[PDB]
């Protein structure tokens, strides 16, 4: 119904901190919810949730509401929270003395920990009631609250300290930049790989068997540009998974699929060349068209058994508190695995291809200077392994360290290393498609 400028600022405050959903969803304990955390019912009936929603909105929503309708529900929750604050002898004196911006910070805390929870901050509250902003900020920065949710606590505390919305303005700008940056990464992956796939598809002289292996690489790198990297970017710019527990588990398995198919194909290409460059005449008398396709179908078969089988069977799940907290939270899509899956998948996806590629490309060049007595072939070796190593080894070292000592690998670092590997899907078409009949092919496609 009736909205205000103060009303709307609190709304946009918590859309950043908690998120907005215009369709009915489930909360951490399975209850139907909509808007910004508005509980519809505890009943295990979607139609029951819809009737409660329709009575509250005043329209036949069928589970789908608008933003303005979400603010109607939200301002009712704010009204209720304020109404209980004034009934609380611990919170009413502080609330009565605060300006509108800092009242929003206090309401934000109540939405996160409950009225009773926030009323336990008696010393911070005394300091806020006396307008001792910097002392209250220091004190709040030592809280259990701060150590549990550092990012949200920093934004709320900044709001208390300054009485401005600067923390939330800085978040919107940060995300918007990462949105453009990752949107660029997405299309470099897509364009570079869709350009390779059709160049093979329509040019008759590019159907070699070494290029038969390359378009399996480019197609594994293409699914990642279309499905894995985009939905991976929503987690970074929003701090949450927005697409439900089921798509979390499907997205996760598609991620480990494409990366397993991609890296193992780099391994097949690695030995393919060797087998073709050291003994070319045996090579053709050994690798038929069926055998070449036999390898790629095996790679994708191995990749499926590393990705969809164990993840859908829940063979990967850890058994700790943050493991179970994330499994119950449909907004958390962290890949909290156990030690055996973390190690087994890393060996199949990355470690055995790394050391096979390291061995193959090494024997290529020792048997090169066995006849010269050049480095334009060494520097090609240098980057084929150099780019592949810098993109994926930082992540799988951190992956195995985290699998033994969780506290050593912070999430930020862990997510950055994974994005280094994501960038390899854009680097590979640049690396493995530089033949004169690739170069002359791409020119023909875009002219």
């Amino acid at each position, epitope marked *: 119904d009736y909205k205000d400028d103060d009303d709307a600022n609190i709304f946009e405050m918590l859309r950043i901190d908690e998120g907005l959903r215009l369709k009915i969803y489930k909360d951490t304990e399975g209850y139907y919810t909509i808007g910004i955390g508005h509980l519809l019912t505890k009943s295990p009936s979607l139609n029951a949730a819809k009737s409660e929603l329709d009575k509250a909105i005043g329209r036949n929503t069928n589970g789908v509401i608008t933003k303005d309708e979400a603010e109607k529900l939200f301002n009712q929750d704010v009204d209720a929270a304020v109404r209980g604050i004034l009934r609380n002898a611990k919170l009413k004196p502080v609330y009565d003395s605060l300006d509108a911006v800092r009242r929003a910070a206090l309401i934000n805390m109540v939405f996160q920990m409950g009225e009773t929870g926030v009323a336990g901050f008696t010393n911070s509250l005394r300091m806020l009631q006396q307008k001792r902003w910097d002392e209250a900020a220091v004190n709040l920065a030592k809280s259990r609250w701060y150590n549990q949710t550092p990012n949200r606590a920093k934004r709320v505390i900044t709001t208390f300290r300054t009485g401005t919305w600067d923390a939330y303005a800085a978040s919107q700008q940060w995300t918007a930049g990462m949105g453009l940056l990752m949107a660029l990464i997405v299309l470099l992956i897509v364009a570079g790989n869709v350009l390779v796939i059709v160049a093979i598809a329509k040019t008759p002289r590019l159907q070699t068997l070494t290029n038969l292996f390359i378009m399996s690489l480019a197609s594994a790198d293409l699914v990642m540009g279309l499905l894995v990297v985009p939905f991976g970017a929503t987690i970074v710019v929003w701090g949450r998974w927005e697409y439900g527990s089921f798509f979390c588990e499907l997205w996760t398995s598609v991620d480990v699929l494409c990366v397993t198919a991609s890296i193992e194909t780099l391994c097949v290409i690695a030995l393919d060349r060797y087998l073709a460059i050291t003994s070319p*005449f*045996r090579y053709q008398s050994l690798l038929t068209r069926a055998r070449a396709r036999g390898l790629v179908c095996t790679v994708w078969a191995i990749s499926a058994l590393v990705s969809f089988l164990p993840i859908l069977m829940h063979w990967w799940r850890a058994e700790s508190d943050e493991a179970r907290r994330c499994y119950n939270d449909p907004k958390c899509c962290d890949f909290v695995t156990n030690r055996a899956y973390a190690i087994a998948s890393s060996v199949v996806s990355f470690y055995v291809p790394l050391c096979i590629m390291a061995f193959v*490309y090494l024997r290529v060049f020792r048997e090169a200077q*066995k*006849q010269v007595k*050049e480095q334009k*072939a060494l520097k*090609t070796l240098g980057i084929i392994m150099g780019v592949f190593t810098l993109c994926w080894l930082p992540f799988f070292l951190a992956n195995v360290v985290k699998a033994f000592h969780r506290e050593l690998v912070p999430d930020r670092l862990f997510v950055f290393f994974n994005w280094l590997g994501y960038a390899n899907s854009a680097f590979n078409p640049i690396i493995y498609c530089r*033949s004169p009949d690739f170069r002359k092919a791409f020119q023909g496609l875009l002219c």
Partner: nanobody
Amino acid sequence: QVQLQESGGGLVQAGGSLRLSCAASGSIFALNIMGWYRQAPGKQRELVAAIHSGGTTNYANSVKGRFTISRDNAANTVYLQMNSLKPEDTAVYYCNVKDFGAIIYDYDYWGQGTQVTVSS
């Protein structure tokens, strides 16, 4: 920066002998394949004999050892001995080298050709 220089052609009667010489001027990568290709009018291009820098060779099936290809290490030069020649061998012969400096794909240098015609 690297060109193939080829010699040894001409005309000979049936059951004759020639030795071909192909010098690969300039420096190129150490793993490679030197070989020979021919194409008669009407027919289309065809391998006859190739040799790898390690030593592995491969002859066509129009050659029952009558032709023997061989390199000469320390020199980018491959030779092809043509013995027991039949009138079916009239074709322009081409010297080819498979360069492997780029590791993902082949690089092909071509000699321009030497005519070979045989009479019965």
